[PDB]
Design an enzyme around this catalytic site. Structure first.
Site, short mmCIF file in Angstrom:
data_model
loop_
_atom_site.label_atom_id
_atom_site.label_comp_id
_atom_site.label_asym_id
_atom_site.label_seq_id
_atom_site.Cartn_x
_atom_site.Cartn_y
_atom_site.Cartn_z
N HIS A 61 -35.99 42.79 -6.72
CA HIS A 61 -35.98 43.45 -5.38
C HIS A 61 -34.66 44.21 -5.14
O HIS A 61 -34.64 45.19 -4.45
CB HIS A 61 -36.17 42.35 -4.34
CG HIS A 61 -37.42 41.55 -4.56
ND1 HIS A 61 -38.66 42.14 -4.45
CD2 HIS A 61 -37.66 40.23 -4.78
CE1 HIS A 61 -39.63 41.27 -4.60
NE2 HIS A 61 -39.03 40.08 -4.86
N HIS A 91 -25.57 42.23 -1.78
CA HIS A 91 -26.54 43.13 -2.43
C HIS A 91 -26.63 44.39 -1.57
O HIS A 91 -26.02 44.44 -0.51
CB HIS A 91 -27.90 42.43 -2.55
CG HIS A 91 -28.50 42.05 -1.23
ND1 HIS A 91 -28.18 40.90 -0.58
CD2 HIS A 91 -29.20 42.82 -0.34
CE1 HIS A 91 -28.79 40.91 0.59
NE2 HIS A 91 -29.42 42.11 0.81
N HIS A 93 -29.42 47.78 -0.37
CA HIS A 93 -30.73 48.46 -0.24
C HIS A 93 -30.45 49.97 -0.33
O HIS A 93 -29.43 50.39 0.22
CB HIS A 93 -31.42 48.13 1.04
CG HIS A 93 -31.52 46.66 1.33
ND1 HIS A 93 -32.70 45.98 1.04
CD2 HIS A 93 -30.62 45.75 1.80
CE1 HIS A 93 -32.49 44.66 1.36
NE2 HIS A 93 -31.23 44.49 1.83
N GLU A 103 -31.37 50.13 5.93
CA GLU A 103 -32.34 49.30 6.69
C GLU A 103 -32.10 49.48 8.15
O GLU A 103 -32.97 49.98 8.89
CB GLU A 103 -32.19 47.85 6.27
CG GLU A 103 -32.55 47.68 4.80
CD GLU A 103 -33.13 46.32 4.43
OE1 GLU A 103 -32.41 45.33 4.70
OE2 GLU A 103 -34.26 46.26 3.92
N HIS A 116 -25.19 44.44 2.19
CA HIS A 116 -25.31 43.19 2.93
C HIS A 116 -24.46 42.12 2.24
O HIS A 116 -24.79 41.72 1.12
CB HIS A 116 -26.78 42.75 2.94
CG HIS A 116 -27.62 43.63 3.82
ND1 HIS A 116 -29.01 43.69 3.74
CD2 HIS A 116 -27.22 44.50 4.77
CE1 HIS A 116 -29.41 44.57 4.64
NE2 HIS A 116 -28.35 45.06 5.31
N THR A 195 -34.26 40.45 6.03
CA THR A 195 -35.05 41.69 5.95
C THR A 195 -36.04 41.68 4.81
O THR A 195 -36.73 42.67 4.61
CB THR A 195 -34.17 42.94 5.87
OG1 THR A 195 -33.51 42.94 4.59
CG2 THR A 195 -33.17 43.02 7.01
#
Ligand code: VMD
Ligand code: VMD
Ligand code: ZN
EC number: 4.2.1.1
Length: 257
Positions: A61, A91, A93, A103, A116, A195
């Site tokens: 992911h 990590h 996104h 996000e 994050h 999330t």
């Protein structure tokens, strides 16, 4: 299994994780005109001098940089928080294109990516217990825009080739997460959720106002990762972001005037 494809993306998650339609889901749009300055918020304390990075993992992911959280070594305190929150992992996104990937949004603006830094409340003893509590986690979120390179990101970028596919890990000792912070610690805060599934409503979100700059070459290397395992059909790890969720009965507070 859940993911970010057409057939298993965020609009499907509620079928296995019904809290996806809950009252404190993340991320959200930060309407900067509606967020109220809260003079009762303390200054944020980010104490990362003794951080002990261990490993980097492609979990299918995102990729996580994991830390030794068996003692207070890298902690977040202050701001909206009561007590001591230990850094467990960070990590990102990110998007397929520079115009999407974050996000959280700011007045509906999407950034190219979002970092994050995930912390758990030491009063609950372990991370697994903390995610079952409404004040269990504090996630420090930092926007990425594309421009100048971030020197402190390059060690992360250069190991990604060695964790291309799901389930690969690599040693990642002596990484200093302080090199990922912007100059200012001005923030917004609100109560929210993880999330990704299981979408638990356990997070105090602290989203910094100042983005960091990363280079086009840095984010291009993010986009060469794979969601798939080795020897499976290649699917690029891009657009691993959940869109903004309804704010419901929540107030976003600003640490700054
Ligand atoms: C299978 C491949 O093919 C397609 C085009 C589906 O995607 C590929 C995929 O990448 C790999 N093939 C399947 C694996 C991944 N997956 C599963 C499903 C359908 N089931 C499903 C189950 C739970 C949820 S949840 N937890 O409520 O969000 C959502 C959907 N769809 N994808
Ligand atoms: C432990 C688990 O073990 C099995 C799989 C056997 O069941 C699970 C059990 O049911 C529960 N045990 C696991 C822990 C619970 N948990 C946490 C996570 C992912 N954390 C995570 C962190 C930050 C963000 S973000 N993007 O910053 O908001 C998003 C997600 N996933 N699960
Ligand atoms: Zn995240």
């Amino acid at each position: 299994h859940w993911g970010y494809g057409k057939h298993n993306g965020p609009e499907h998650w509620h079928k296995d994780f019904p809290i996806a339609k809950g009252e404190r889901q993340s991320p959200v749009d930060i309407d900067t005109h509606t967020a109220k300055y809260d003079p009762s918020l303390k200054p944020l304390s980010v104490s990362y001098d003794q951080a002990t990075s261990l490993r980097i993992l492609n979990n299918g992911h995102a990729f996580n940089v994991e830390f030794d959280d068996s003692q207070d070594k890298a902690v977040l305190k202050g701001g909206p928080l009561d007590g001591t929150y230990r850094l467990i992992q960070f990590h990102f996104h990110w998007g397929s294109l520079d115009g999407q990937g974050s996000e959280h949004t700011v007045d509906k603006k999407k950034y190219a990516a979002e970092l994050h830094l995930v912390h758990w409340n030491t009063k609950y003893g372990d991370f697994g217990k903390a995610v079952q509590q409404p004040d269990g986690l504090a996630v420090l979120g930092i926007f990425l825009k594309v421009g100048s390179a971030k020197p402190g990101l390059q060690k992360v970028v250069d190991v990604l080739d060695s964790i291309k596919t799901k389930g690969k890990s690599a040693d990642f000792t002596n990484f200093d997460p302080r090199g990922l912070l912007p100059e200012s610690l001005d923030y917004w805060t609100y109560p929210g959720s993880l999330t990704t599934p299981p979408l638990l409503e356990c997070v105090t979100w602290i989203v910094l106002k100042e983005p960091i700059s990363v280079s086009s070459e840095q984010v291009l290397k993010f986009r060469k990762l794979n969601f798939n395992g080795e020897g499976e059909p290649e699917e690029l790890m891009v657009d691993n972001w959940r869109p903004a969720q309804p704010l419901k009965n929540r107030q976003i507070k600003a640490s700054f005037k």
